[PDB]
Design a protein around this ligand. Structure first.
Ligand code: CHL
Ligand code: CHL
Ligand code: CHL
Ligand code: CLA
Ligand code: CLA
Ligand SMILES: CC(=C/C=C/C(C)=C/C=C/C=C(C)/C=C/C=C(\C)C=C=C1C(C)(C)C[C@H](O)C[C@@]1(C)O)/C=C/[C@@]12O[C@]1(C)C[C@@H](O)CC2(C)C
Ligand SMILES: CC1=C[C@H](O)CC(C)(C)[C@H]1/C=C/C(C)=C/C=C/C(C)=C/C=C/C=C(C)/C=C/C=C(\CO)C(=O)CC1=C(C)C[C@@H](O)CC1(C)C
Ligand SMILES: CC1=C[C@H](O)CC(C)(C)[C@H]1/C=C/C(C)=C/C=C/C(C)=C/C=C/C=C(C)/C=C/C=C(\CO)C(=O)CC1=C(C)C[C@@H](O)CC1(C)C
Ligand SMILES: CC1=C[C@H](O)CC(C)(C)[C@H]1/C=C/C(C)=C/C=C/C(C)=C/C=C/C=C(C)/C=C/C=C(\CO)C(=O)CC1=C(C)C[C@@H](O)CC1(C)C
Ligand SMILES: CC1=C[C@H](O)CC(C)(C)[C@H]1/C=C/C(C)=C/C=C/C(C)=C/C=C/C=C(C)/C=C/C=C(\CO)C(=O)CC1=C(C)C[C@@H](O)CC1(C)C
Ligand SMILES: CC1=C[C@H](O)CC(C)(C)[C@H]1/C=C/C(C)=C/C=C/C(C)=C/C=C/C=C(C)/C=C/C=C(\CO)C(=O)CC1=C(C)C[C@@H](O)CC1(C)C
Ligand SMILES: CC1=C[C@H](O)CC(C)(C)[C@H]1/C=C/C(C)=C/C=C/C(C)=C/C=C/C=C(C)/C=C/C=C(\CO)C(=O)CC1=C(C)C[C@@H](O)CC1(C)C
Lengths: 223, 223, 223
């Protein structure tokens, strides 16, 4: 009634009349009528874009927590990681002693980047092949909402709550994608992790805003 | 007869027979039949691309004058700006004494970048909402040519002259967009403003061409 | 039977059922059913994309040989080029003595970058105009397979062998495009030519892999 149908919520709010393409009829989750570039005029291209958006969104929602958790644990929990900041976490594998999980030498204790890379290649290749075509966990009936084995708690057994939860999922996913783009740009510009940036903004908001580093083009002092 | 219809002017000149997509029938302004990438084969995507092109073009036409005027005034008019070149003009707000207009400390005299940014956010948000949906100045009857309040002098009251003026507008806009891409690349490469670059090419054209800085990839001396 | 039709080869192999768009019916060469982004849903956009892919592929097939040949000749043949590595070959024109072909001062012996650039502009403009619309060498009956003057040996006179050779061409071209992207990224990251990189990987594969330079973002040590 508010996120589906003709009377739904739109991206420009009260100024959305005429900013909504005719092919965005509020049928799919997250339909705020924002296709100003006309990249989803074709229904098949629209479906491909929806799948890409939802997959990017779920990956970004995992990534926000994965980038905040080690740095937050180091700053406020006392855990001594090798590199808590997310953009330096990969370089842990080259450090002496390897990549210890939670800073504990008896956990994971990875030492070879090649083994990690190729194990991930194999596992993720199988996983994405199953995503596209089905596998051990079931058949890919829906490209985005397979359910069954991926809804063990049965939170989507009811169609209206299913639609509401799809709206919530796509909205939190778009927020997390926005936050991950923010993480990328903040790492490029400030050179410090998101937790450090947040702790600095709340300390002196006026003097520690984003325009302090505005003279750099994504970290490059060109001028 | 020359910029509309089947006998119009095409992008490859005499070698255009067979390089013109069938959906570019010379109906809309600036139709030189250049869609080699097939990005406007969908009519709705074509309309979205036309709107994007015209808005980008009008912004670039404003930008050409906006980037040339302060630097030209400083170089040949004697006006003492804080930062005349366009790519350093933003940094004036961080300088001591703020951002004075025309170098006069009694004009504008901006001192806070947050105030500028958020005032612009509010004003431009309202302005673009009006562009999409209409507002105080009228109704968005046409996404690109609203007329009425935006044609006060009535220069588009004649359909033939209206089409000719639309062709002139789109051509000057494409030229301005090309020039602004040039401004961006020249700022990245040479590191000096467009007026300085122009004054240098006209001094020693052979020795001060664009290949002097060809060893830098958009300013970065990678190799 | 294996690269055309319904029983052809697919991009995800055994996990391709449901990963193939309905509009990729295995009619055109190189149809592995990989359009996950839905950029070729429109048939006209599909044709434009096929033309772009084949042209990029032929250019990359030329480019791989053109980038490997001078460096390989310098390393294993003894030819003394001014700059054997492909990403520095352009800067030979600025060196003292100009650009000598094969290092011989009696071959080409180019001295002006402007003459090279503008001669190439004229010649390539005429050549691409002919490609689009036909010219001295024939008429552009097909955008990608004109034949006639461009098949002098008559290797495409049999439709079955013609289809097989089209598949071979598109596959070798896609491999060459992949390799040219590899050349770009390796030049950005390592800073040395592809032949040097290959000679280093085969010397100490474990210690001279691609993760040694993983801390740099396309050559920039941002962190
Ligand atoms: C009534 C006014 C209203 C306005 C003006 C907007 C406007 C917007 N909404 Mg929106 N909304 C509004 C009401 C509402 N919205 C929403 C729900 C949503 C959603 C869910 C989303 C939006 C999004 C957007 C944005 C999409 C367009 C865009 O990206 O422009 C921005 C383009 C610009 C050019 C602005 C730049 C201005 C700024 C000063 C730039 C400064 C640049 C740097 C200083 C220098 C540049 C650096 C260079 C060198 C690289 C836009 C800001 C989307 C979004 O947030 O995407 C980002 C989005 O997902 N809205 C609701 C609830 C129903 C509203 C209720 O009233
Ligand atoms: C008869 C020959 C004729 C030819 C060959 C062209 C060709 C062109 N016209 Mg055109 N026109 C011609 C006659 C006419 N035109 C027009 C009206 C127009 C218009 C309005 C427009 C064109 C545009 C174009 C360009 C579009 C394609 C392109 O972008 O290629 C360029 C692609 C290349 C790969 C060329 C690069 C060659 C160069 C040597 C590159 C060197 C690279 C660097 C040195 C190194 C690379 C750096 C790396 C590291 C990043 C192209 C140059 C469009 C344009 O200007 O866009 C740019 C455009 O808007 N034409 C008219 C009037 C009716 C003609 C009349 O006869
Ligand atoms: C059975 C398993 C099987 C799997 C899983 C694949 C999977 C793939 N095939 Mg494929 N194939 C498979 C069987 C077969 N293929 C083919 C014939 C082909 C062809 C002709 C082609 C493919 C291509 C592809 C790739 C296209 C999707 C992609 O780009 O993902 C990759 C996306 C990722 C996100 C993977 C990244 C993982 C990696 C660990 C990333 C590491 C990141 C860095 C370390 C850090 C990031 C840097 C940052 C900072 C920028 C993909 C790897 C295409 C290709 O090669 O494109 C590249 C292609 O042209 N296949 C045949 C013959 C019929 C098969 C037979 O069984
Ligand atoms: C709108 C048209 C236009 C005009 C009039 C100019 C004019 C100029 N440019 Mg320029 N440029 C343009 C577009 C334009 N540019 C675009 C679109 C790009 C992006 C590829 C560049 C990238 C560029 C660089 C990187 C440099 C110049 C430079 C220059 C100056 C010397 C001439 C030269 O080397 O040309 C170079 C022209 C090109 C690279 C492309 C021109 C294509 C249109 C030709 C027809 C001269 C004032 C040089 C400078 O600062 O002089 C000191 C310089 O270093 N330009
Ligand atoms: C035909 C494909 C092809 C081949 C044969 C090679 C071969 C090679 N690459 Mg390479 N590369 C490729 C594509 C390819 N690349 C592409 C597409 C990219 C862009 C992501 C790169 C980016 C890249 C970097 C950044 C580096 C290499 C390096 C190397 C050399 C060491 C092996 C290595 O680290 O692998 C790295 C392989 C990848 C990053 C991706 C390969 C994917 C194919 C898997 C099958 C080796 C000669 C390294 C080097 O110079 O050695 C000293 C190095 O530093 N490559
Ligand atoms: C990528 C590439 C492109 C070459 C393009 C050429 C040659 C274009 C010619 C382009 C040629 C062009 C346009 C010719 C045009 C000729 C004309 C119009 C002839 C004619 C006439 C007229 C005048 C009487 C007029 C009448 O009305 C019609 C006609 C027909 O009678 C080359 C790559 C390499 O050369 C390097 C750089 C280095 C090497 O080591 C390796 C290789 C690979 C060889
Ligand atoms: C709508 C619309 C309409 C118009 O008409 C046209 C239009 C404007 C174009 C269009 C709009 C479209 C828009 C806005 C596009 C925006 C896209 C964005 C921002 C996408 C963002 C994606 C971000 C992702 C996936 C992040 C993943 C992170 C990971 C991986 O999971 C890790 O963190 C993994 C990780 C972790 C967890 C710990 C670290 O230490 C190490 C690493 C590996 C980094
Ligand atoms: C209306 C409404 C009603 C509902 O009831 C609820 C609701 C929906 C919530 C609500 C809606 C809310 C709406 C629409 C509000 C819109 C907000 C907007 C547009 C604000 C945007 C602000 C823009 C900013 C600060 C950009 C600053 C750039 C910096 C600083 O860091 C750079 O340095 C730039 C820079 C430079 C110079 C160098 C580059 O290399 C890197 C970068 C970072 C890009
Ligand atoms: C046709 C076609 C067919 C094929 O099939 C596929 C295809 C090839 C893709 C396709 C072709 C498409 C092509 C060629 C694309 C080209 C796009 C280009 C160059 C767009 C350029 C746009 C540039 C703009 C808006 C400039 C704005 C500047 C401003 C803002 O107004 C200021 O200056 C503002 C300003 C001023 C005034 C003072 C300064 O101090 C500070 C700042 C803030 C910078
Ligand atoms: C026919 C006709 C008839 C009508 O009656 C009237 C008409 C329509 C007018 C007329 C039509 C006219 C036509 C078609 C002409 C076409 C003109 C063309 C294609 C000219 C192109 C010239 C290309 C140039 C100079 C590029 C140089 C690159 C540099 C130098 O600066 C870099 O350093 C490269 C570089 C490097 C190496 C590092 C990167 O990081 C940055 C960059 C800058 C990219
Ligand atoms: C399929 C698909 C489905 C999804 O749904 C969406 C999707 C994922 C997007 C989509 C996938 C598409 C993909 C993977 C895109 C990839 C594109 C790539 C890698 C294109 C690469 C092209 C590279 C080229 C032309 C190289 C030419 C080199 C030259 C010039 O000939 C020289 O070397 C010239 C040269 C030589 C020879 C000597 C040197 O000294 C000097 C220079 C001038 C450099
Ligand atoms: C199944 C099958 C059956 C048929 O019968 C035959 C068949 C078809 C052949 C066969 C099919 C084969 C298949 C599917 C295999 C698939 C293989 C894959 C996915 C390989 C992936 C490996 C990924 C790698 C190494 C990435 C490493 C990144 C580096 C290292 O250099 C960076 O430093 C990353 C980096 C960083 C950190 C900074 C950036 O600035 C620059 C870069 C380089 C991006």
């Amino acid at each position: 009634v508010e996120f589906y149908g003709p009377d739904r919520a739109l991206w420009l709010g009260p100024y959305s009349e005429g900013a909504v393409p005719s092919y965005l009829t509020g049928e799919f989750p997250g339909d705020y009528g924002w296709d100003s570039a006309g990249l989803s005029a074709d229904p098949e291209t629209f479906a491909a874009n929806r799948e890409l958006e939802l997959i990017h969104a779920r990956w970004a929602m995992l990534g926000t927590v994965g980038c905040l958790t080690p740095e937050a644990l180091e700053k406020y929990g006392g855990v001594e990681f090798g590199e808590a900041v997310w953009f330096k976490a990969g370089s842990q594998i080259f450090a002496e002693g390897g990549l210890d999980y939670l800073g504990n030498p008896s956990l994971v204790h990875a030492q070879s980047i090649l083994a990690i890379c190729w194990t991930q290649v194999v596992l993720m290749g199988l996983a994405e092949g199953y995503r596209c075509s089905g596998g051990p966990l079931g058949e890919a009936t829906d490209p985005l909402y397979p359910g069954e084995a991926f809804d063990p708690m049965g939170m989507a057994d009811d169609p209206e709550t299913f639609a509401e939860l799809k709206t919530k999922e796509i909205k939190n996913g778009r927020l997390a994608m926005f936050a991950m783009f923010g993480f990328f740009v903040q790492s490029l510009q400030t050179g410090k992790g998101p937790v450090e940036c947040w702790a600095e903004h709340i300390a002196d908001p006026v003097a520690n805003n984003g325009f302090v580093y505005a003279t750099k083009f994504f970290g490059a002092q060109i001028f």
